Write a protein that binds this ligand. Structure first.
Ligand code: HEM
Ligand code: HEM
Lengths: 137, 137
C-alpha cells in the first residue's frame, strides 16, 4: 500500500463503520445469490466478515496487530475448506457493498483504495491458512 | 514504504548478501562493543543480519515469512528482548551496511535501509508484544 492509499483508507473507514449494518447485509446477500457454490461451506447466519475487514483497515498500518485474531479465524477457515481462490470473489462482493453504500461519495480512487486494502488484508489470511494447511500434513 | 525505497531495497539486497560475512561480523562486533548491556541476553550468535536481508527481499509480502518470524519471536520473548532494543540493533546494522556499501552508500540508500529495517522491526515488536501478553493470560 502506498501512503496516499493508506490515507484514503484512514479517512473513509469510519464512514464505512457508520453504515456497517448495510454493508454487512448487502455483502452476504450478494455473496450467496451471485456465488451459490460457496453456500455449503458456511437464525445462525454469518455476520462478521465485513466488519472484520474494517477492523483490519482501521489498523492498515499495523496488520500484525490483528494476527492473534487472524490466527484464530484461519483455523476456522482451514476447517471449512476456504481456498485462496475464494478471496477475490469475497472481495468483489465487499467492494460492491462499499460502492452501493458510499453512493455518490463513491469516487474511483476511493474504490481503488479499498480494492488495494482488501488485497493486502486477504494476503495475510491466505498465508496464514496456507501455512496451517501445510502444517496439517 | 514508498516505491523508490522498495526499489532501492530490492536492487541492493543482493550486494549486501554477497557481502554477508562482513556485514554479519561487523554487526555483532560493534553491537557488543558499543552496547555491553545486551551481552548477557545472548558458539556465537550469527543469524540476525542475514535474516533481516531475507525479510527485506520479501518486504512486499511480509506474511510469507511469518512462520519464521513467529518462531524467532518465541526465542526473543524467551530471551527478554524489548522493543527499545530494536533501535540499537538497527543502528549497528546500518553502520555495517554503510561500511559494506562503500561508495554506493549514498544517503538515499542508507535512508531506504533505515526505513526498511524499521518496517521489519515493527512486525517483530508487535508479534512479541502479543506473545508477552499471551504469557500472562
Ligand atoms: C479477509 C477476508 C475474510 C475475513 C476478514 C473473514 C472473516 C471471518 C470471521 C470473523 C469468521 C468467524 C470466526 C468465528 O468467530 O467463529 C469467518 C468464518 C468463516 N469464513 Fe471468513 N473471512 C474472510 C474471507 C473468507 C473467504 C474468502 C471465505 C470463503 C468462502 C470465507 C468463508 C468463511 C466460512 C465458511 C466461515 C465459517 C463460519 C463458521 O462456522 O463460523 N471467509 N470469516
Ligand atoms: C528485526 C530484527 C531481528 C531479527 C531479524 C532477529 C533475528 C534473530 C534470529 C534469526 C535469531 C535466532 C533464532 C534461532 O535460530 O534460534 C535471534 C535470536 C535472538 N535475537 Fe534477534 N533478531 C532481531 C532483533 C533482535 C534484538 C532487537 C535483540 C536484542 C538485543 C535480539 C536479541 C536476540 C537474542 C538475545 C536472541 C537469542 C540468542 C540465541 O539465538 O540463542 N534480536 N534473533
Amino acid at each position: 500500500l502506498d501512503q496516499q492509499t493508506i490515507n484514503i483508507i484512514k479517512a473513509t473507514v469510519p464512514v464505512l463503520k457508520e453504515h456497517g449494518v448495510t454493508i454487512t447485509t448487502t455483502f452476504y446477500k450478494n455473496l450467496f445469490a451471485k456465488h451459490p457454490e460457496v453456500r455449503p461451506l458456511f437464525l445462525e447466519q454469518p455476520k462478521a466478515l465485513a466488519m472484520t475487514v474494517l477492523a483490519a483497515a482501521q489498523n492498515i498500518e499495523n496488520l500484525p496487530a490483528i494476527l492473534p485474531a487472524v490466527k484464530k479465524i484461519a483455523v476456522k477457515h482451514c476447517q471449512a475448506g476456504v481456498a485462496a481462490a475464494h478471496y477475490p470473489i469475497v472481495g468483489q462482493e465487499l467492494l460492491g457493498a462499499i460502492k452501493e453504500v458510499l453512493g455518490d461519495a463513491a469516487t474511483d480512487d476511493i474504490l481503488d483504495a479499498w480494492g488495494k486494502a482488501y488485497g493486502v488484508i486477504a494476503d495475510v489470511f491466505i498465508q496464514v491458512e496456507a501455512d496451517l494447511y501445510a502444517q496439517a500434513v
